[PDB]
Design a protein around this nucleic acid. Structure first.
Ligand SMILES: [Mg+2]
Ligand SMILES: [Mg+2]
Ligand SMILES: [Mg+2]
Ligand SMILES: [Mg+2]
Ligand SMILES: [Mg+2]
Ligand SMILES: [Mg+2]
Ligand SMILES: [Mg+2]
Ligand SMILES: [Mg+2]
Ligand SMILES: [Mg+2]
Ligand SMILES: [Mg+2]
Ligand SMILES: [Mg+2]
Ligand SMILES: [Mg+2]
Ligand SMILES: [Mg+2]
Ligand SMILES: [Mg+2]
Ligand SMILES: [Mg+2]
Ligand SMILES: [Mg+2]
Ligand SMILES: [Mg+2]
Ligand SMILES: [Mg+2]
Ligand SMILES: [Mg+2]
Ligand SMILES: [Mg+2]
Ligand SMILES: [Mg+2]
Ligand SMILES: [Mg+2]
Ligand SMILES: [Mg+2]
Ligand SMILES: [Mg+2]
Ligand SMILES: [Mg+2]
Ligand SMILES: [Mg+2]
Ligand SMILES: [Mg+2]
Ligand SMILES: [Mg+2]
Ligand SMILES: [Mg+2]
Ligand SMILES: [Mg+2]
Ligand SMILES: [Mg+2]
Ligand SMILES: [Mg+2]
Ligand SMILES: [Mg+2]
Ligand SMILES: [Mg+2]
Ligand SMILES: [Mg+2]
Ligand SMILES: [Mg+2]
Ligand SMILES: [Mg+2]
Ligand SMILES: [Mg+2]
Ligand SMILES: [Mg+2]
Ligand SMILES: [Mg+2]
Ligand SMILES: [Mg+2]
Ligand SMILES: [Mg+2]
Ligand SMILES: [Mg+2]
Ligand SMILES: [Mg+2]
Ligand SMILES: [Mg+2]
Ligand SMILES: [Mg+2]
Ligand SMILES: [Mg+2]
Ligand SMILES: [Mg+2]
Ligand SMILES: [Mg+2]
Ligand SMILES: [Mg+2]
Ligand SMILES: [Mg+2]
Ligand SMILES: [Mg+2]
Ligand SMILES: [Mg+2]
Ligand SMILES: [Mg+2]
Ligand SMILES: [Mg+2]
Ligand SMILES: [Mg+2]
Ligand SMILES: [Mg+2]
Ligand SMILES: [Mg+2]
Ligand SMILES: [Mg+2]
Ligand SMILES: [Mg+2]
Ligand SMILES: [Mg+2]
Ligand SMILES: [Mg+2]
Ligand SMILES: [Mg+2]
Ligand SMILES: [Mg+2]
Ligand SMILES: [Mg+2]
Ligand SMILES: [Mg+2]
Ligand SMILES: [Mg+2]
Ligand SMILES: [Mg+2]
Ligand SMILES: [Mg+2]
Ligand SMILES: [Mg+2]
Ligand SMILES: [Mg+2]
Ligand SMILES: [Mg+2]
Ligand SMILES: [Mg+2]
Ligand SMILES: [Mg+2]
Ligand SMILES: [Mg+2]
Ligand SMILES: [Mg+2]
Ligand SMILES: [Mg+2]
Ligand SMILES: [Mg+2]
Ligand SMILES: [Mg+2]
Ligand SMILES: [Mg+2]
Ligand SMILES: [Mg+2]
Ligand SMILES: [Mg+2]
Ligand SMILES: [Mg+2]
Ligand SMILES: [Mg+2]
Ligand SMILES: [Mg+2]
Ligand SMILES: [Mg+2]
Ligand SMILES: [Mg+2]
Ligand SMILES: [Mg+2]
Ligand SMILES: [Mg+2]
Ligand SMILES: [Mg+2]
Ligand SMILES: [Mg+2]
Ligand SMILES: [Mg+2]
Ligand SMILES: [Mg+2]
Ligand SMILES: [Mg+2]
Ligand SMILES: [Mg+2]
Ligand SMILES: [Mg+2]
Ligand SMILES: [Mg+2]
Ligand SMILES: [Mg+2]
Ligand SMILES: [Mg+2]
Ligand SMILES: [Mg+2]
Lengths: 127, 111, 197, 106, 48, 157
RNA sequence: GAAAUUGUUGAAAGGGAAGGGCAUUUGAUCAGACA
RNA sequence: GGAAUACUGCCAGCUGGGACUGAGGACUGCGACGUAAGUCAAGGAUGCUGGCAUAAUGGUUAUAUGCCGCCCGUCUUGAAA
RNA sequence: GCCCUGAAAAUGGAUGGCGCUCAAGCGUGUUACCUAUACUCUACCGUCAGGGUUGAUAUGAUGCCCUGACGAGUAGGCAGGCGUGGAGGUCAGUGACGAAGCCUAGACCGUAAGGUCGGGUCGAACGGCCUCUAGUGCAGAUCUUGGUGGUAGUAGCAAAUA
RNA sequence: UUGGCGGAAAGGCCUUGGGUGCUUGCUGGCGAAUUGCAAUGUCAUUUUGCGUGGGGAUAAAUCAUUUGUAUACGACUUAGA
């Protein structure tokens, strides 16, 4: 149970692909601004791809929030998790990718006793 | 543009519904009567009807009452513009020009 | 309200009938068109003859096979005037053209169903009295359709069979109208007459 | 009785559109028996459902239903606009859509 | 034009029977054997 | 540390709700709902059933009682917008429904004996009124259905 | 031990290109919320 | 000679049906209804009730459908050329 | 006024097409109706301007909060940020029960540059933040180097007697 | 089950006879409920597969070989228990 918040609207749920990204393998999918003179994207013709701009911004009430309602926070050890004791309903713990298996059982045993939500409890389960 | 001779009804439909007054830099609506008193109390105007009285009966202090009103943001008319060709004169069957009293039908449609 | 609408072609125009069918074909209605040899075209016969030979000389130059096909069938000429009113190059237009079955004459599957007319498409409710008309069956024979005699022979054959059915029907509705003679003087008919029946 | 129809049958015409620009959020529903906009005022606010079928058992029922309602009238021949919860899939043009009588007014 | 009835003979020769097959040496020569059952009755199906 | 800690740490206490100004007003029904109206049902398990109206309840619902002998409709709530009301009136002056309310149709299998005996009391004074006018018992048993060529904007119901 | 390219298996589509945008259906797949 | 009606204009006259929106988060301000206690549509939504608690809504992706979309970069008054 | 003759060009053709002829033509009116990223209202992001707010115990006063208007754009200017090599400091950071890299129509966050997580492979160094530095960000320069396709299992493997 | 008609894609129509179900043409008896205030509340239709029961049928084509009326290659055209 997190803080009460309104309905989160992203206003663009789609990843921005670059113009001519799926046609050439040399062109990555990261959005980079087309700065030509005969572009069909810079001049914004109809039926083409949309450009990301400041109108696509999310509400500040619903900014940096997961669909659970909490914010994310990378947790390395126990000392980096005890700071979130009085803020369990706002932030959520997230065990880092380079954490060994002997320390993930320690972090999950500590956040359970403190009520801090861990976003990745299924990481490196010996099953 | 197209200008006309308004009656008391169509002036009253604009000051109450689309009435906005410019205080120091901001477009402020005329929701309360003491707001007008705090700006035009030197000229005797202390209600929203004292603004309307200066409009239809143009007194010696019409300029300060007219400069106080923000320009009315009118909408498109509800029953259309009438004639299909707008950019001819109203005498030739268009929209612009010195239309007379028929403006009162056209303001309430746009409001 | 009918699932399949059967439109008679006799006494109708071309452009005012194909427009009121191609709209109904995009509405989900199945329309069959029978007796297309009696379909009529406004204007005199020689003008509508000149507007086909002006189109008959229109073909692809390097290969006349790939050019515009010049059909002689009156059922297919009306289908040509209807496929220009449907966006046939899309998948939506291909589904509207499968909803139609346009025939020459009245086929034995479609001879026992009631045919309709379209009052905004008759040749008499639209044209002025004193204007010349053009029968599509007389037009098709003069440009190369070979099947006028095999249809009018079979059209005269069904009219003998349709007159024997109607002579049985008008002799039966007379017996129905004579069986309503005992419906009078009853208290039930004096109560249905007060309720609009 | 041989009939159990407590709705009004109707066809999906198209979306709200220009010559080229279309709006998929607003559809056009033709009501059978209505030729004037004065007769289309009775169907305002009636819930429109599109009954179609599928193959997966999601409720023990292959039949799946999308919902919608009536917003306003369209044109002069009695065309009725309709906004839906999820939009119609643009293949169902000329498909029989159901127009119920609830919420009633009489 | 449309063909709707083609009536054959009863005892055909082996010439047109060889025409109907591409391999007369592998065929069982069983062409028009069930058609000869039509001529075995009185002839109600023949004159029909 | 894999991520630097924030600086502000906003408050965990939830803000109290503001005093909204919305009162509970009684519902004004339409003029076609008088006590004793034959009602045509649109949705539910008893759709198309012509049935007798008795009384507006408190929680914006209507009393649908019977007759259970005629068409088999028990004591049942209904919504006001889901009902087409006709122009046929039946007497309601001998109906003893006063105790039926929101607590009577509240959920807590098996049919309660209170629901069975209260159905026969109400359906005793109604069928004696139905039999006074001709063809009303046959009218309520039959279900409603729209035929071909019917235009519900034209119908009077 | 990446990409170009390419093999097999699996899924999908294909009436003279392919690829894209808005919206939805169907198919595959998935997180979150609930006590 | 006396009325009616059409047309135009006005009402701080009444009232039915439909659509979209619910943003704000203790109180304050401005008014109304009352003899008063108080109440209210009065500086922006609550009250009641049902179903489900699962891929059902939704997200991604493939495909289909309606409509739209002529390969960019560059020099150019002007590039799909 | 309309129509007709005047009125003849080359691939097959253009009121956009079908087609229409008391016209869906021409001329003139009446209303009804259709729709722009325009207009009016509302939500949200961002910019600019005018303002409120150091009082203590509890944390950004380059902050919070209120109100109003505005938002196109090549050449070009400026500001806020993202990513990489390396260095000072710091979290007594991460790691041989698995670091970096790579693969992933699996998930999440940011308008975006990108960041994060799960699974597979892998075998050993690497990262967050505050700053400093720079042969620091690529799609096309008939770019360089290296590698590989369509063409294509096609052209062809035919002078000099076998 | 009897007698005909229908070939424009007939594939349908009309009629005789008995058997049987229902009849709301009129008058009764009993049952409905809790799908809990609505959720299309599923009743059609298309093709295929695997099982039971019953009747009926018991072959060809290609390659290879061969002929030249044919022939770039395929095809075509012949022959061979
Ligand atoms: Mg995003
Ligand atoms: Mg992603
Ligand atoms: Mg670029
Ligand atoms: Mg340019
Ligand atoms: Mg361009
Ligand atoms: Mg640790
Ligand atoms: Mg991990
Ligand atoms: Mg990883
Ligand atoms: Mg100033
Ligand atoms: Mg109007
Ligand atoms: Mg309008
Ligand atoms: Mg207009
Ligand atoms: Mg103009
Ligand atoms: Mg207005
Ligand atoms: Mg269609
Ligand atoms: Mg259809
Ligand atoms: Mg061609
Ligand atoms: Mg055409
Ligand atoms: Mg066309
Ligand atoms: Mg047929
Ligand atoms: Mg006429
Ligand atoms: Mg529209
Ligand atoms: Mg939508
Ligand atoms: Mg479609
Ligand atoms: Mg035969
Ligand atoms: Mg052979
Ligand atoms: Mg209150
Ligand atoms: Mg009410
Ligand atoms: Mg009312
Ligand atoms: Mg009954
Ligand atoms: Mg190796
Ligand atoms: Mg394999
Ligand atoms: Mg696939
Ligand atoms: Mg091809
Ligand atoms: Mg879940
Ligand atoms: Mg709980
Ligand atoms: Mg009024
Ligand atoms: Mg709120
Ligand atoms: Mg008072
Ligand atoms: Mg109040
Ligand atoms: Mg679930
Ligand atoms: Mg479950
Ligand atoms: Mg659901
Ligand atoms: Mg969905
Ligand atoms: Mg795709
Ligand atoms: Mg379309
Ligand atoms: Mg296009
Ligand atoms: Mg291209
Ligand atoms: Mg490009
Ligand atoms: Mg030049
Ligand atoms: Mg220039
Ligand atoms: Mg040019
Ligand atoms: Mg260019
Ligand atoms: Mg040419
Ligand atoms: Mg052409
Ligand atoms: Mg011309
Ligand atoms: Mg025309
Ligand atoms: Mg036109
Ligand atoms: Mg005109
Ligand atoms: Mg009007
Ligand atoms: Mg009209
Ligand atoms: Mg400040
Ligand atoms: Mg700008
Ligand atoms: Mg920035
Ligand atoms: Mg940097
Ligand atoms: Mg660095
Ligand atoms: Mg460091
Ligand atoms: Mg690793
Ligand atoms: Mg590597
Ligand atoms: Mg992988
Ligand atoms: Mg993947
Ligand atoms: Mg990939
Ligand atoms: Mg995340
Ligand atoms: Mg995650
Ligand atoms: Mg791993
Ligand atoms: Mg080593
Ligand atoms: Mg180390
Ligand atoms: Mg720096
Ligand atoms: Mg460099
Ligand atoms: Mg790049
Ligand atoms: Mg570049
Ligand atoms: Mg490169
Ligand atoms: Mg290159
Ligand atoms: Mg290169
Ligand atoms: Mg090279
Ligand atoms: Mg190669
Ligand atoms: Mg080889
Ligand atoms: Mg060779
Ligand atoms: Mg050579
Ligand atoms: Mg040699
Ligand atoms: Mg020699
Ligand atoms: Mg020799
Ligand atoms: Mg047929
Ligand atoms: Mg036949
Ligand atoms: Mg046959
Ligand atoms: Mg019987
Ligand atoms: Mg029965
Ligand atoms: Mg019956
Ligand atoms: Mg069922
Ligand atoms: Mg042998």
């Amino acid at each position: 149970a997190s803080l009460p918040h309104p309905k989160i609207v992203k206003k663009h749920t789609k990843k921005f692909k670059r113009h001519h990204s799926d046609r050439y393998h040399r062109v990555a999918e990261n959005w980079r601004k087309q700065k030509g003179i005969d572009s069909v994207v810079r001049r914004r013709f109809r039926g083409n791809i949309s450009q990301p701009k400041i109108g696509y911004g999310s509400n500040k009430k619903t900014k940096f929030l997961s669909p659970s309602g909490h914010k994310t926070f990378l947790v390395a050890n126990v000392k980096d998790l005890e700071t979130l004791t009085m803020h369990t309903k706002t932030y959520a713990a997230e065990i880092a990718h380079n954490i060994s298996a002997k320390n993930r059982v320690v972090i999950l045993a500590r956040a359970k006793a403190l009520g801090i939500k861990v976003t990745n409890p299924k990481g490196r389960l010996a099953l | 543009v197209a200008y006309g001779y308004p009656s008391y009804s169509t002036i009253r439909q604009l000051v109450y519904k689309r009435g906005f007054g410019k205080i120091n830099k901001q477009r402020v609506p005329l929701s309360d009567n003491a707001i007008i008193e705090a700006n035009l109390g030197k000229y005797g105007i202390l209600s929203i009807d004292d603004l309307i009285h200066e409009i239809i009966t143009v007194g010696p202090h019409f300029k300060q009452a007219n400069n106080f009103l923000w320009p009315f943001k009118l909408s498109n008319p509800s029953g259309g513009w009438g004639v299909p060709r707008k950019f001819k004169h109203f005498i030739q069957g268009g929209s612009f020009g010195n239309r007379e009293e028929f403006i009162n039908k056209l303001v309430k449609s746009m409001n | 309200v009918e699932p399949v609408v059967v439109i008679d072609g006799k006494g109708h125009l071309v452009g005012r009938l194909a427009s009121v069918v191609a709209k109904q074909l995009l509405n989900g209605q199945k329309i069959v068109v029978v007796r297309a040899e009696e379909l009529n075209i406004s204007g005199e016969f020689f003008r509508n003859k000149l507007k086909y030979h002006d189109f008959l000389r229109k073909a692809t130059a390097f290969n006349k096979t790939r050019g515009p096909f010049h059909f002689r069938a009156p059922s297919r000429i009306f289908y040509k005037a209807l496929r220009g009113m449907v966006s046939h190059k899309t998948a939506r237009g291909k589904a509207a053209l499968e909803r139609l079955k346009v025939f020459e004459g009245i086929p034995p599957p479609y001879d026992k169903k009631k045919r309709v007319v379209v009052p905004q498409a008759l040749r008499v409710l639209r044209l002025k009295p004193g204007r010349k008309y053009t029968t599509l069956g007389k037009l098709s024979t003069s440009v190369g359709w070979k099947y006028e005699d095999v249809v009018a022979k079979l059209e005269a054959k069904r009219k003998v069979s349709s007159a024997e059915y109607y002579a049985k029907k008008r002799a039966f509705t007379k017996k129905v109208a004579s069986a309503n003679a005992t419906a009078a003087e009853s208290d039930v008919a004096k109560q249905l007459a007060a309720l609009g029946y | 009785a041989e009939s159990h129809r407590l709705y009004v049958k109707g066809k999906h015409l198209s979306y709200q559109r220009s010559k080229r620009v279309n709006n998929p959020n607003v559809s056009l529903i033709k009501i059978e028996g209505v030729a004037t906009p004065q007769d289309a005022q009775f169907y305002l606010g009636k819930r429109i459902a599109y009954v179609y079928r599928a193959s997966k058992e999601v409720r023990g029922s292959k039949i799946r239903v999308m919902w919608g309602k009536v917003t306003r009238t369209h044109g002069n021949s009695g065309v009725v606009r309709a906004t839906f919860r999820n939009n119609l899939p643009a293949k169902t043009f000329g498909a029989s859509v159901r127009i119920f009588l609830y919420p009633s007014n009489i | 034009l449309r063909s709707l009835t083609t009536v054959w003979a009863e005892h055909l020769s082996d010439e047109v029977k060889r025409r109907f097959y591409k391999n007369w040496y592998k065929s069982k020569k069983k062409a028009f054997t069930k058609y000869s059952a039509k001529y075995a009755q009185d002839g109600a199906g023949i004159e029909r | 540390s894999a991520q630097k800690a924030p600086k502000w740490y906003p408050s965990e206490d939830v803000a109290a709700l503001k005093k909204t100004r919305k009162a509970a007003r009684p519902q004004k029904l339409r003029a076609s709902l008088v006590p004793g109206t034959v009602l045509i049902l649109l949705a539910g398990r008893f759709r198309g059933k012509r049935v007798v109206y008795l009384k507006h309840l408190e929680d914006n619902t209507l009393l649908i009682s019977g007759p259970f002998k005629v068409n088999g409709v028990p004591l049942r709530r209904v919504n006001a917008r889901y009902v087409i009301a006709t122009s046929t009136k039946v007497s309601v002056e001998g109906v003893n429904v006063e105790k039926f309310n929101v607590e009577y149709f509240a959920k807590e299998k098996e049919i309660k004996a209170e629901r069975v005996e209260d159905q026969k009391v109400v359906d005793k004074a109604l069928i004696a009124e139905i039999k006074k006018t001709p063809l009303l018992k046959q009218y309520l048993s039959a279900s409603f259905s729209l035929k071909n060529g019917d235009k519900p904007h034209m119908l009077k119901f």
